[PDB]
C-alpha cells in the first residue's frame, strides 16, 4: 500500500489513534484526527502540525477523505461512518494498516475469554525458541508500534471490533477460542453478528485452530482441511485425566503433565492447548513451547491473588469483563467460608442470568456497583448490597470478612463507566484490599 498524497482521517485518538498518527507522518502523510470526545486520551500528545476536531465527528472531513482509519471503539454502524461507506470511501483500522506492512508471519487470536492469556503464552513459546517475536494488538502495544523488519514472528490479540475493519490478514495460524455473549451494545443483530465479526479471522488463514467444545468457533462452511481442534475430552489437542492428574495430549500422545504448569484450572489447560496448537502451526519447536507452559505465571488482573493475609484471599479478576469470564472464575470455585463477590460496571446489555446458578447457598454475598449495579443485585436480592462505586462496596464488605473467606473482584462488566480500563479497576481493588485486609 502507498498513502502518499491521500487525505487521511483518523477517527478516535487514544494510544491506538496516536500510533496511527505516527504511522502516516513517518510515511510522509499528515493525517487529520477527529474524536466524538471533547478531550480524548492522548490529545496532549498529538503533534502540533496535526489538524484535529473533537467533541463530534466532522462530516466535511469524513466526506473529503480518501481513507478513514477508524478506532475499534467507534461502530462502523455510526451514521457518519455508514454514510462514508455508502459513498465508497475506504475505511480501515490500525490492524489493517499493520497487515499491509508486516514482513513476518502473524499468529492471530480472538474469542470472548482467554485471548490475552493465549496471546501471551504463544509469545513466551516464541521467546523460549530464541525467536524475535512482537506481541501486542488488543493487549500490550498497539500493533503498529511492533512493526520492525527484524521481527521474525508477530502474535496479535485481535478484538471482534478490530477484525470488523480488517481485510488483509493472512494468518499463519488463527483461532477463535470461544464465543459467549459480549459486546451486545455494539452488535444490534445479536450473538451471530458478534460471531460473524470473529469469523473474519479465519479468512485466508493457513491453519485454523477451533474449539471442539464450542460450535460457534467453527467456520460457517464447517471445519475444513485447514482446521486443527482443541478440547477437553475430544480434539486434536485435548486433556487426559486420571486419578488426581491431568495431561495435555496431542493426537493420543502425552506432551505435558499440568503439575508442571504454574497456571491451574481446566480453562487454563485448554488455553495451554490452544497456544500449543498455534505455536506448532507457526513452526515453533515443540520442546521450547512446552518449556514456556511451565514458566508462565499468568497476567495481572486475571484471577490474581493480590493479598493472602489473616486467612482471607483477596482476588483481582478485574479482567472478567463479561459473563463467560465470571463463570470461569465461579465454576468449581472452592471457598472455605463466605465468598464476597464484587459485580458491576457497564454490563454492555449482557444477560447476567447465567451467573445465578453459581450463587445459591448460604456462603455467598454480592456487592454490586457501577452503571448496572441494580441488574446484578437482582440476581439474588436477598444476599445483595448495591453501591455507586467499587470503593464503597469494598468498605461495605471489609468489616464482614472473616478468616476462611474470599473477596473476589470478578465483575462481569466493562469498567469504562467509572474507570479508564479494567487495569485501573484492578489496581484500585489491589490498593483497597491492602488497606482493608490488614490491621
Ligand atoms: N470518535 C470516536 C471515538 C473513538 C474512540 C473512542 C474510544 O472508546 C473506546 C476505545 C476502545 C475500546 C475497546 C473496547 S473493547 O470492547 O475491545 N474492550 C473493553 C475493555 C473494558 C475495560 O477495560 O473495562 C471490553 O471488553 O468491554 C471497548 C470499548 C472501547 C471504547 C471513543 C470515541
Domains of the chain: 1-92 (3.40.50.720), 93-298 (3.40.1190.10), 299-433 (3.90.190.20)
Return the residue whose CA atom lies nearest to atom 29 of ligand 1. Answer: 73
Angle between helices 115-128 and 286-295 (to 10 degrees): 120
**Residue 80 labelled as part of a binding site:** no
Alpha helices for 239-384 (secondary structure H): 266-281, 286-295, 323-330, 373-377
Q: What is the DSSP letter of 184?
A: G
**Residues 194-233 as b or e (16 or more Cβ within 10 Å = b):** bbebbbbbbbebebbbbbbbbebbbbeeeeeebbbbbbbe
CA of 26 to the centre of ligand 1 (A): 26
Cα(428) to ligand 1 centroid in Å equals 20
Say how far residue 330 (Cα) sits from the centre of its chain.
19
Nearest atom, ligand 1, residue 41 CA: 7
**Which phi-psi region, left, alpha or beta, contains residue 294 (left: φ > 0; alpha: ψ -120 to 50)?**
alpha
263 close to 328: Cβ distance less than 8 angstroms:
no
Contacting residues for 310 by C-beta, under 8 A, at least 6 apart: 403, 437, 438, 439
Cα distance between residue 433 and residue 405, in whole Å:
13
The Cα–Cα gap between 33 and 55 comes to: 12
Half-sphere exposure of 306 (CA within 13 A, CB side): 26
Residue in 277, 286, 283, 282 with CA at minimum distance from that of residue 106: 282
**Could you tell me where the DSSP H helices lie in 165-285?**
190-199, 266-281
Ligand 1: which of 112, 184, 371, 414 to mutate, most ligand atoms within 8 Å of CB? 414
Note whether 144 and 20 are within 8 A (CB): yes
Closest CA to 377 of 355, 407, 409, 401: 355
With cell 454490586, the residue in question is 368
- Please tell me the residue having the least CA distance from ligand 1 atom 27: 414
Residue 184 and residue 348 in contact, taking contact as beta carbons nearer than 8 Å: yes
φ and ψ of 345, to 5 deg: 120, -150
Q: 112: closest CA among 408, 312, 328?
A: 328
Pick the atom of ligand 1 nearest to 57's CA: 1
CA distance 178 to 188: 20
Cell output for 27: 510515511
In this structure, are strands 8-11 and 67-70 parallel, antiparallel, or unpaired?
Answer: parallel
Q: For residue 157, what are the β-bridge partners?
A: 109, 137
Residue 241: how many CA atoms within 13 Å on its side-chain side?
Answer: 9
Q: Residue 206: CB partners within 8 Å, gap ≥ 6?
A: 170, 171, 172, 173, 226, 281
Backbone angles phi, psi at 19, to 5 degrees: -65, -35
Q: Rounded to the nearest whole angstrom, what is the distance from the C-alpha of residue 182 to the centroid of ligand 1?
A: 13
**Burial environment of residue 113 by CB neighbours within 10 A (0 to 12, 13 to 18, 19 or more):** buried
The answer to the question of whether 71 is labelled as a binding residue is no
- Answer whether 355's CB lies under 8 Å from 382's CB: no
Q: Which three cell numbers stand for residue 325?
A: 469470564
DSSP H/E element including 82: helix 79-86
Q: Which residues line ligand 1 (CB under 6 A)?
A: 11-12, 14, 35-37, 71-74, 159, 161, 183, 321, 414-416, 421-422
**Alpha-carbon gap, residue 392 to 271, rounded angstroms:** 35
The alpha carbon of 96 and the centre of ligand 1 are apart by a number of angstroms equal to 18
Closest atom of ligand 1 relative to the 11 alpha carbon: 1
Task: Tell which residue, 14, 8, 4, has the closest CA to residue 67.
Answer: 8
- Dihedral in degrees, nearest 10, Cα atoms 372, 376, 378, 383: -130
Q: Are 253 and 245 in contact (CB under 8 A)?
A: no
| Residue 350 vs residues 370, 376, 377, 412: alpha-carbon distances, Å | 15, 11, 14, 9
The protein residue whose alpha carbon is closest to atom 12 in ligand 1 is 73
**Cβ(317)–Cβ(410) under 8 Å?**
yes
Sequence-distant (≥ 6) Cβ neighbours of residue 134 within 8 angstroms: 104, 141, 146, 147, 148, 151, 153, 154, 155
Kindly give the pairing relationship between strand 246-250 and strand 8-11: unpaired
Contacts of 7 (CB under 8 A, 6+ apart): 32, 64, 65, 66, 67
Contact at 8 Å (CB) between 344 and 376? yes
Q: Is 5 exposed, middle or buried (0-12, 13-18, 19+ CB in 10 A)?
A: exposed
Q: 320, 352 in Cβ contact below 8 A?
A: no
Rounded CA separation 124/365 (Å): 38
- 117 labelled ligand-binding: yes
> Which of 18, 41, 71 to mutate to test ligand 1, by most ligand atoms within 8 A of the CB atom?
71
Residue that has been written with the C-alpha cell 473476589 in this structure:
408
This structure's resolution (Å) is 1.9
The DSSP bridge partners found for residue 386 are 368
- Determine whether the annotation assigns residue 175 to a binding site: no
Instruction: List CB contacts of 395: < 8 A, sequence separation 6 or more.
Output: 432, 436
Query: Counting atoms of ligand 1 from 1, which one is nearest the CA of 159?
Result: 17
Q: Is residue 301 within 8 Å of 392, Cβ to Cβ?
A: no
Q: In whole angstroms, give the CA distance from residue 41 to residue 324.
A: 29
Cβ within 8 Å of residue 261, ≥6 positions away:
268, 269, 272, 293, 294, 296
Q: Point out the residues that are catalytic.
A: 115, 138, 183
Nearest Cα to Cα of residue 173 among 270, 265, 106, 234: 106
* CA-closest residue to ligand 1 atom 8: 73
Would you put residue 130 in left (φ > 0), alpha (ψ -120 to 50) or beta? Answer: left
d(CA 239, CA 217): 19
Which residue's C-alpha comes closest to atom 25 of ligand 1?
A: 414
Q: 198 C-alpha vs ligand 1 centroid, how far in Å?
A: 17
**312 half-sphere exposure, CB direction, 13 A CA radius:** 22
Bridging pattern class, strands 106-110 and 153-157? parallel
Alpha carbon nearest to ligand 1 atom 16, residue: 183
Cβ atoms of residues 422 and 319 within 8 Å: yes
- CA 128–ligand 1 middle distance (angstroms): 33
- Contact between 350 and 208 under an 8 Å Cβ cutoff? The reply is no
Q: Are strands 253-257 and 246-250 parallel, antiparallel or unpaired?
A: antiparallel
Interatomic CA distance for residues 159 and 175, integer angstroms: 12
Cβ atoms of 29 and 6 within 8 Å: the answer is yes
Q: Does the annotation place 113 within a ligand binding site? A: yes
> What distance in Å separates the CA atoms of residue 152 and residue 420, rounded to the nearest whole number?
33
Q: How distant is the alpha carbon of residue 261 from its chain centre?
A: 22
Cβ atoms of 416 and 345 closer than 8 Å = yes
Query: In the PDB record, what is the listed experimental method?
Result: X-ray
Amino acid at each position: 500500500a502507498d498513502y502518499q498524497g491521500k487525505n487521511v482521517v483518523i477517527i478516535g485518538l487514544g494510544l491506538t489513534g496516536l500510533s496511527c498518527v505516527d504511522f502516516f507522518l513517518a510515511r510522509g502523510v499528515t493525517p487529520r484526527v477527529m474524536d466524538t470526545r471533547m478531550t480524548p486520551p492522548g490529545l496532549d500528545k498529538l503533534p502540533e502540525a496535526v489538524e484535529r476536531h473533537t467533541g463530534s465527528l466532522n462530516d466535511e472531513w469524513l466526506m473529503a477523505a480518501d481513507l478513514i482509519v477508524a478506532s475499534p471503539g467507534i461502530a462502523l454502524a455510526h451514521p457518519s461512518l455508514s454514510a462514508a461507506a455508502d459513498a465508497g470511501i475506504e475505511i480501515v483500522g490500525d490492524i489493517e494498516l499493520f497487515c499491509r506492512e508486516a514482513q513476518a508471519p502473524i499468529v492471530a487470536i480472538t474469542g470472548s475469554n482467554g485471548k490475552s492469556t493465549v496471546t501471551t503464552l504463544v509469545g513466551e513459546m516464541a521467546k523460549a525458541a530464541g525467536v524475535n517475536v512482537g506481541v501486542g494488538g488488543n493487549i500490550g502495544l498497539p500493533a503498529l508500534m511492533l512493526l520492525d523488519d527484524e521481527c521474525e514472528l508477530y502474535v496479535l490479540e485481535l478484538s471482534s471490533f478490530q477484525l470488523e475493519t480488517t481485510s488483509s490478514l493472512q494468518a499463519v495460524a488463527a483461532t477463535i477460542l470461544n464465543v459467549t455473549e459480549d459486546h451486545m451494545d455494539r452488535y444490534p443483530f445479536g450473538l451471530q453478528q458478534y460471531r460473524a465479526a470473529k469469523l473474519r479471522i479465519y479468512e485466508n488463514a493457513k491453519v485454523c485452530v477451533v474449539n471442539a467444545d464450542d460450535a460457534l468457533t467453527m467456520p460457517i462452511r464447517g471445519a475444513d482441511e485447514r482446521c486443527v481442534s482443541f478440547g477437553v475430552n475430544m480434539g486434536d489437542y485435548h486433556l487426559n485425566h486420571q486419578q488426581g492428574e491431568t495431561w495435555l495430549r496431542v493426537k493420543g500422545e502425552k506432551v505435558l503433565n499440568v503439575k508442571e504448569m504454574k497456571l491451574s484450572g481446566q480453562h487454563n489447560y485448554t488455553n495451554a492447548l490452544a497456544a500449543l496448537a498455534l505455536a506448532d502451526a507457526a513452526g515453533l519447536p515443540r520442546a521450547s513451547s512446552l518449556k514456556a507452559l511451565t514458566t508462565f505465571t499468568g497476567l495481572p488482573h486475571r484471577f490474581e491473588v493480590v493479598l493472602e493475609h489473616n486467612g482471607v484471599r483477596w482476588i483481582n479478576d478485574s479482567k472478567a469483563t463479561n459473563v463467560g469470564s465470571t463463570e470461569a472464575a465461579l465454576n468449581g470455585l472452592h471457598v472455605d467460608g463466605t465468598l464476597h463477590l464484587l459485580l458491576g460496571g457497564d454490563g454492555k446489555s449482557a444477560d447476567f442470568s447465567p451467573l445465578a446458578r453459581y450463587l445459591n447457598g448460604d456462603n455467598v454475598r454480592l456487592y454490586c456497583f457501577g452503571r448496572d449495579g441494580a441488574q446484578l443485585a437482582a440476581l439474588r436480592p436477598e444476599v445483595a448490597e448495591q453501591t455507586e462505586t467499587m470503593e464503597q462496596a469494598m468498605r461495605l464488605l471489609a468489616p464482614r470478612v472473616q478468616p476462611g473467606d474470599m473477596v473476589l473482584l470478578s465483575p462481569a462488566c466493562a469498567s469504562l463507566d467509572q474507570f479508564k480500563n479494567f487495569e485501573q479497576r484492578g489496581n484500585e481493588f489491589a490498593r483497597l484490599a491492602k488497606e482493608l485486609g490488614s490491621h
